[PDB]
Design a protein around this ligand. Structure first.
Ligand SMILES: CC(C)(C)c1ccc(S(=O)(=O)NCc2ccc(C(=O)Nc3cccnc3)cc2)cc1
Ligand SMILES: CC(C)(C)c1ccc(S(=O)(=O)NCc2ccc(C(=O)Nc3cccnc3)cc2)cc1
Lengths: 469, 470
């Protein structure tokens, strides 16, 4: 089983001896510090609260386990057994902590308080920052959700421009990232964050996470269709690629099907195999069951353009009301290699310059979507801003001489709407003056209980783009 | 409850219908495909085999769960209920798969077969690639271990050059990455991979993973010491940084202690607080209990060099036998901000140019060590190379016209020692010709059972640097 006493950075085990004597309160906050990605989607804390922080998280056995581990790890007895004992005895092992947070799905500009943490019992002043490590991992679903939303903005802009509407936008970026992330747990968290913005995923782990921790009215939050991989093509033998294609599209004749087409020669496959030998099997398909051709190698922009060029000459292309070229409805393309936020932009802009509608294409992204992200992207950070020592509150902060970007906020914080309807974080307990309407932070956790929860439907509503509003 | 029927890429649910009819065997392999990182440390498969693949992994309940999920996810019944039920009924839910692998800890040049997978029952031809997704996640511990070892090579070169030995090498790169990875599970996996090469870690999750899945003779594989964070300094108030410093070093007077010193002004902290006001509390400390000063902001190289110059004028510096400057034994530095393999190289070279021994310094790395890595780095990839259809074996491969780097290997594979003692991968079943001696892969998994495994001590031995060996 998971042991919260072993789920912190080692050095934090020693911090109870380092704070000022007579400290009864340590109050800390999380922000995506201002330093590109001007606003972030707050998502993922509810998962952490439920899986790791709520209920009886301290037991006699867990305390002894930690004591034994830290004895060897530090070669010294430094572990605060007395402090953990107190929580076990007084609170039946529930954490005396209060966390207040902005609603999940909320889109907030950089440099604003997103959640705060403080101890509710003076004996547990040390506990606030014990749980920094576990809480800071919220950086990941925040960053995946944010980066996914930024790609949706790019897709929406170009889809609207080239088609006149946003039909199909929520299926334009498919999660291919299950194999490319660092763990099973990561896969679930990351896939769920992408699903805040889109509905197409192959990362099955995301579905179970959403069902367990968030919930949706619909049976599932994400969908897929039958699709080939290189192995189901190559297994037929080099000389039988056409037989593989024919078998697969016939097996899946009445649903959408994606067929990876670059095993040997993507251009030959498009022009000769799909475009001639098997054309009769494609032009007969329903609009609700297109063939989706999938290139998977070469320069992503150059390959997409060449594939469209080939297909446009073998299949009947129309010109939409915006003046952009459109493949027949039984034929589409998905580019699922080398896609990240930067290359996505390059591809849709290249398509627009060549007069191809974004209606023609969808994207798959794996490592770019779920793995190629760090805590530095949005500067997700947790800092102490207020302590009470000898009954007096003190506003505290860091402000390193050589890096003003690392200065932290001072005092008790609150988040408010400005008169123009934007966001502002008030420092130094100024929220108490009541000049800025209600605090947007809500208590979500208190003394071992989750006190406020959001459904996945609510989160999706909060995270909507302006364009779709 | 983890459910292997829900632990694959969605599209793989539909693949059993796409293979050629009457296919009885699918054989696939994993490599770090050849495209800075010329050799890789193979590590992490044993964790995956034990946690996720071994024993009864299929139950009636798990089949029903998967059936219900995929029905909604595909809006259709496409899920191979019959195929999974066959495994349940015939093998008590144990996977009819055989996996052969190179020993864990082995250091192997890019483009070699690292492991192979095939089904052991013709009915389960579809199972080989079902588990691609979960096995390909081995990229992560491989890549962490490899990148960590590459940093160790850099540290060894400069430590040897500036000091004449490698004392302390295994504590030169400390894992600070627990908060900066994407999940608790990732933290344990990544931290364990770093511990293949080093012994200093704050990512506690790695200890329990190693103990459970690998094992060591020592009670724990990794160690740490008391250390401050910004909150334990700043909580004292801006005008009381000296009081914080004094309290902390007095609390930890007889063990090593690291104190973050850049809350307000690192240069003032070093020159005036440590170098003057509290100097008497530092020069009194044991060699076994140094103050370790931690800067955490600014240009990493410029800041390290300036901190060292400041301390060198406030404390007695010696010149070691190699001609490099050395702080007294009660005083050291750790640079734990902005460290990745690139900036590490830059810092130690900069120190060498300014005649400072690498003995003076250690590094902490967080996101750079455990998170800022992708499957692309070593091109970790799983591909089908051999199938049997209608009783005929076929050597299969991809070879995309626009990217020769993505060409995959053909046929049955084996790994061998060359006459010069290097590794070579033989394709097309040619290992059977016996011109290259025995296959170096070992069967590690067969029909639900782990059949070969390695202790963490063995893995560490396999992963040693040549310079450590010599
Ligand atoms: C559900 C609905 C019918 C609306 C639909 C959703 C999504 C698409 S799509 O074209 O955006 N994506 C379908 C798809 C699914 C999986 C794969 C695929 O190749 N997945 C995969 C997974 C992991 C690694 N590599 C590839 C390709 C296309 C089409 C229709
Ligand atoms: C165990 C032994 C006595 C040999 C030893 C090991 C390692 C060092 S070290 O100086 O390489 N590292 C000690 C250390 C530990 C933790 C921190 C620290 O600040 N950790 C931390 C963790 C997470 C985030 N940020 C910082 C700093 C120095 C010194 C002695």
């Amino acid at each position: 089983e998971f042991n919260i006493l072993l789920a912190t950075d080692s050095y934090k085990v020693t911090h109870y001896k380092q704070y000022p004597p007579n400290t009864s309160k340590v109050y800390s906050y999380f922000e995506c510090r201002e330093k590109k990605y001007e606003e972030t989607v707050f998502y993922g804390l509810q998962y952490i609260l439920n899986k790791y922080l709520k209920g009886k998280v301290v037991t006699k056995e867990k305390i002894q386990e930690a004591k034994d581990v830290y004895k060897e790890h530090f070669q010294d007895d430094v572990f605060n057994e007395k402090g953990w004992n107190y929580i076990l005895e007084k609170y039946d092992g529930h954490l005396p902590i209060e966390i207040k947070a902005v609603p999940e799905g909320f889109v907030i500009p950089r440099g604003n308080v997103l959640f705060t943490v403080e101890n509710t019992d003076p004996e547990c002043y040390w506990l606030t920052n014990w749980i920094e490590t576990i809480l800071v991992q919220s950086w990941y679903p925040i960053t995946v959700a944010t980066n996914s939303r930024e790609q949706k903005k790019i897709l929406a802009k170009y889809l609207l421009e080239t088609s006149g509407n946003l039909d199909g936008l929520e299926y334009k970026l498919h999660d291919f990232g299950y194999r490319g992330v660092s763990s099973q747990e990561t896969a679930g968290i990351g896939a769920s964050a992408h699903l805040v913005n889109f509905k197409g995923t192959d990362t099955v782990a995301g579905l179970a996470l959403i069902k367990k921790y968030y919930g949706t009215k619909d049976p599932v939050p994400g969908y897929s269709v039958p699709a080939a991989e290189h192995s189901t093509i190559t297994a037929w033998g080099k000389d039988h690629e056409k037989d593989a294609f024919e078998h697969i599209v016939t097996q899946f004749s009445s649903v959408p099907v994606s067929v990876v087409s670059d095993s040997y020669d993507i251009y030959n496959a498009c022009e000769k195999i799909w475009g001639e030998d098997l054309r009769h099997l494609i032009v007969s398909r329903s609009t609700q069951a297109p063939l989706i051709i999938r290139p998977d190698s070469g320069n992503p922009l150059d390959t997409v353009l060449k594939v469209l060029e080939i297909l446009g000459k073998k299949f009947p292309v129309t010109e939409n009301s915006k003046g952009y070229k459109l493949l027949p409805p039984y034929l589409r393309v998905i580019q699922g290699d080398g896609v990240d936020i930067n290359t996505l932009q390059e591809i849709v802009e290249g398509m627009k310059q060549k007069m191809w509608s974004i209606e023609n294409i969808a994207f798959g992204s794996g490592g770019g979507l779920l793995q190629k992200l760090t805590r530095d992207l949005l500067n997700c950070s947790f800092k102490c801003s207020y302590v009470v020592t000898n009954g007096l509150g003190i506003n505290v902060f860091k402000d390193p001489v050589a890096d003003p970007n690392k200065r932290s906020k001072k005092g008790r914080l609150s988040l408010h709407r400005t008169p123009a309807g934007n966001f502002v974080t008030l420092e130094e307990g100024k929220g108490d003056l009541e000049e800025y309407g209600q605090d947007l932070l809500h208590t979500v956790f208190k003394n071992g209980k989750v006190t406020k929860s959001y459904s996945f439907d609510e989160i999706r509503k909060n995270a909507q783009l302006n364009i779709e509003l």
